[PDB]
Paper text:
YsxC (YihA in Escherichia coli) is a 22 kDa essential GTPase in Bacillus subtilis. Depletion of YsxC in cells leads to the accumulation of a 50S assembly intermediate known as the 44.5SYsxC particle. YsxC binds in the body of the 44.5S large ribosome assembly intermediate, occupying the site where uL2 binds and controls the timing in the folding of rRNA helices forming the binding site for uL2. Overall, these results suggest that YsxC serves as a placeholder factor for r-protein uL2 and provide the first example of the involvement of such a factor in the ribosome assembly process in bacteria.
To achieve this, we incubated the 44.5SYsxC particles at 37°C for 15 min in the presence of a 10-fold excess of YsxC in a buffer containing 2 mM GTP. Visualization and analysis of the maturation reaction using cryo-EM and image classification techniques revealed that the 44.5SYsxC particles evolved into five distinct classes after YsxC-GTP treatment. Importantly, the local resolution of the density representing uL2 in classes 2 to 5 was similar to other areas of the particle body. Analyzing the uL2 density from the four maps revealed that uL2 is bound to these classes in a single conformation, identical to that on the mature 50S subunit. From class 2 to class 5, we observed the progressive maturation of the uL1 stalk base (H74-75), CP, A, and P sites. The CP is still absent in classes 2 and 3 but becomes progressively more complete in classes 4 and 5. The A and P sites are fully immature in class 2, but they progressively show more densities for the rRNA helices comprising these sites in classes 3 to 5. Only the E site remains immature in all classes, likely because it also requires the influence of other assembly intermediates, such as RbgA and YphC. An important consequence of the correct accommodation of uL2 in classes 2 to 5 is that H62, H65, and H66 around the uL2 binding site become properly organized, adopting their mature conformation. Nevertheless, uL6, located below the bL12 stalk, became stabilized in class 5, representing the most mature particles in the dataset.
Residue numbers in the entry:
A (entry chain C): 2 to 276
B (entry chain d): 1 to 44
RNA sequence: AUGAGUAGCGAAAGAGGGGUGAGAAUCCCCUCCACCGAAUGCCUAAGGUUUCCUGAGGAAGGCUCGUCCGCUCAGGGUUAGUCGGGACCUAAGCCGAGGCCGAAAGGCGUAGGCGAUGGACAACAGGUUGAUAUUCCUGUACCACCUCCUCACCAUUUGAGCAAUGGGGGGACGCAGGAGGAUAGGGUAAGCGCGGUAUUGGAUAUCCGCGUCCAAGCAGUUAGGCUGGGAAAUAGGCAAAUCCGUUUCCCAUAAGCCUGAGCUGUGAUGGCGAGCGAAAUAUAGUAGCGAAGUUCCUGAUUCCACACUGCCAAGAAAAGCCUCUAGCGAGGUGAGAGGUGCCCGUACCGCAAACCGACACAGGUAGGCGAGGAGAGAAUCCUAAGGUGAUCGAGAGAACUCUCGUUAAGGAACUCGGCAAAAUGACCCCGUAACUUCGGGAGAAGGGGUGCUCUGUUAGGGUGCAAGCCCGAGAGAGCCGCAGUGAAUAGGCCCAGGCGACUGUUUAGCAAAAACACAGGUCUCUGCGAAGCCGUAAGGCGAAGUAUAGGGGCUGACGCCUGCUGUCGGGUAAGUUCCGACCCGCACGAAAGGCGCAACGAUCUGGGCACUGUCUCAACGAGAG
RNA sequence: UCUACCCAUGUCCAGGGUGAAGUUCAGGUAACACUGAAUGGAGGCCCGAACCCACGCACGUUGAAAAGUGCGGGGAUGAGGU
């Protein structure tokens, strides 16, 4: 599902793109679209707080259901579309009553399949089951807080997690990163892996494409003079203060931990991967 | 060769106007200072 | 005061005859001549503020003069139910009842509002004054509201009306490409008015000018789209719903539905129209009179219309105006008469002497139209409609300075350096290397022909009964110049090396290069809902993101590899540039080398052909001082 | 109200081109090759006006101008101009 462009001209040379061979539509649902404006990385004070962010194409937000509350009433897949504000693809489900919602498309879904959310729902794929399933199985979209907040972990293209043991009111679950954590058994999740696993292998090609997505150039901290960045600013001498650039805000950033101590959340963690 | 002054009535009134100066306490201080001296044109 | 009656008087074509006056190179009239014409034309923003029209003026301002003026003094001049804004709607942002923080002053923010650069929305043709005109006048219209008094059909839950609070629609929306249809516009053949020429010749295939028309309200049309209709039943749409979704059947397979550029009649026995041209009106010219008013070719950068097809960067916002459902609760359709159906702007300049630059300043200033010939073209030259003669002049033709044109014989001998100037450049035909990442290099390099007449309304096509246009190939013949893209506009090529792909900064105004940054890629380290970041906090950015976000060092890309001072030769008659050998070292788990293919590279360094006033060595000529 | 970056909403870019691609249709090879046609023609492509820059030389330097003019030059569907 990846297409390679011919070396007709420099700039298009090496640019790989997707085939979008999953989207069966081209129009959104005028009932689930909502406005969304750009920000440029500026606070409520009007000052820049996040850099290398500004510009791009316009985009409309599609409201997705990360709570899978409708329990019992069946629904059918209608179309798989494209969402510009996420990495995965979305699916329009037509419930028996006639509600219409959007759900994160699970890997290997196809028009016609009838989904089912609930404690008595079957395993299959896309079925939202509360944390009371087998001690194994690829699971996605998990709720950390007691059910009601909505899925937060494992929600992007190709991501997948696994349920291990069950400790009383908690459930041992390995997270994508590689860490293991105890999740309140009261929580709910789905079944399957998020799709479009070819997203990790696409060459942007030219500066322009990056700008189209909303990324601004980045200047090496070393080249900027010591006023703006710790160490730097040379014209004809050997590196002036350089070889120890440090972060632009005067803080260490190499083999330096950040996870705050007294986390009050060190009781549910067990393994440590990317903290 | 653009010069530094480009006239516009809306911007002038929105920035230097009376109704704008009467919003903060510093603008009211400016108005009081102008009144004390005796200027004919208060604000703009 | 001195410099000193010195420098300057701010891009441009005028000449004569009248006039007026105390006074005229500079003001009015006439006739010839010259300049712009994808503007120096017209209409109209921002901004200006009376600069606009008429009668007087000659103190100051106009780089001179002045009888003149954007100057001075007196009077005048701007008309809206339909054009633009408000008694309509929302974006970014701003304000913010209660509320949350904070020594005070204050910071932030919910309900709710304000805010066009966008969305909704009813009128067209002609005439007129010294100054306004979709506004005044004459004709034909449309829109919302009322019943003063009416009129005709048609009256109470026997439901008229009813919207939200529901739902549809809008507002519905991106970029690029190419068909088709139709018009704005541009040029022929009938026709109507004039003329028959004193320089040779023309009553004629002779010459000049003209050849139409609104909105509305009638009818019928290219095209387009539908997702096709019909019947039942509903765990949804805060209550409700016949409305919208959903499901099950039935028939389709042509019906039905909704949008449309344009055309034909009627507005129109109307009004416009070449030219005749009254009095005297103040002799203008108006009053006034008024012919024909068709067919044929070529047409869009405009309309159908983001309608159709493709692409990923996924695309528009938002709300109201509109329809339709029910919760609520009696008069509706068509004529006649109305309200006059309110407020703000309306003069004049807006590529300029009325705006921004201290100036009547060689600079700057959103948008809509924008003809002909030759032409691919909004290029170039000459011209239409229209506008202009740009505010110091006479005469002489010295040195010198600036901007231009030629030049004997030699050509780079000049110079830090071919800096500068010269040469090439338009079409159509033939041909086109090493080296490559296979796309390129490539308009590589290099050769040949164009003018005018007759076969000739050529073959064909399109164009269209035909006629009238073309693309009109392709041929033959034959004439004549020194010259055939006869003027103006339009690549100089070729060998060897370093550095870095398109882009940005320039160090706005002494550096645009290998300067320098950026960049697609590579690698490392932190964050499981956050790490970071901004704030005293409250509040936010990250983000309506969930291994995606931070931070660091790298960096064309792509490869491979891979981590991640000799001295000599060979060139010039007389050599840095490049060599292959000398290296001196290697530093390099990354880091080097060896990888120019391309660049659209205003890059740096060597060498060839053509060409030349760069020079041996200067000489004439044109314009400004 | 100059200038740097960002947010919402509008608008501008005469003409021409060897000719790229993917794609499709046919001959063709088991299919890749190779031919034609369409595809027009996407692209930080090419030549070139309006428009935007500011590389060389000359003049100006008590300037027409407190940063200009003349002749050449670069980009010109986009990391565009306004």
């Amino acid at each position: 599902a990846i297409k390679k462009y011919k070396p007709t001209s420099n700039g298009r040379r090496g640019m790989t793109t997707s085939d979008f061979a999953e989207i069966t539509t081209d129009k959104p649902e005028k009932s689930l679209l909502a406005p969304l404006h750009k920000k440029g990385g500026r606070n409520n004070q009007g000052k820049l707080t996040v850099r290398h962010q500004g510009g791009g194409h316009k985009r409309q937000y599609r409201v997705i259901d990360f709570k899978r509350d409708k329990d019992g009433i069946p629904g059918r897949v209608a179309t798989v579309e494209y969402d510009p504000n996420r990495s995965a693809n979305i699916a329009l489900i037509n419930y028996a009553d006639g509600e219409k919602r959007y759900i994160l498309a699970p890997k290997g879904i196809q028009v016609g399949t009838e989904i089912m959310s609930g404690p008595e729902a079957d395993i299959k794929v896309g079925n939202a089951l509360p944390l009371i399933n087998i001690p194994v199985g690829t699971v996605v979209h998990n709720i950390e807080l007691k059910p009601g907040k909505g899925g937060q972990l494992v929600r992007s293209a190709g991501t997948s997690a696994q349920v291990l043991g069950k400790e009383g009111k908690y459930v041992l679950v390995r997270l994508n990163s590689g860490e293991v954590r105890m999740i309140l058994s009261a929580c709910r999740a789905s079944i399957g892996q998020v799709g479009n696993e070819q997203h990790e292998l696409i060459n942007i090609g030219k500066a322009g494409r990056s700008r189209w997505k909303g990324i601004r150039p980045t200047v090496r901290g070393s080249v900027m003079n010591p006023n703006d960045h710790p160490h730097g600013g040379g014209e004809g001498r050997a590196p002036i203060g350089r070889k120890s650039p440090m972060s632009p805000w005067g803080k260490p950033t190499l083999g330096f931990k950040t996870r705050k101590k007294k986390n009050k959340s060190d009781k549910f963690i067990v393994r440590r991967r990317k903290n | 060769m653009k010069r530094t002054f480009q006239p516009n009535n809306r911007k002038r009134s929105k920035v230097h106007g009376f109704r704008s100066r009467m919003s903060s306490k510093n603008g009211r201080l400016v108005l009081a200072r102008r009144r004390r001296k005796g200027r004919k044109v208060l604000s703009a």
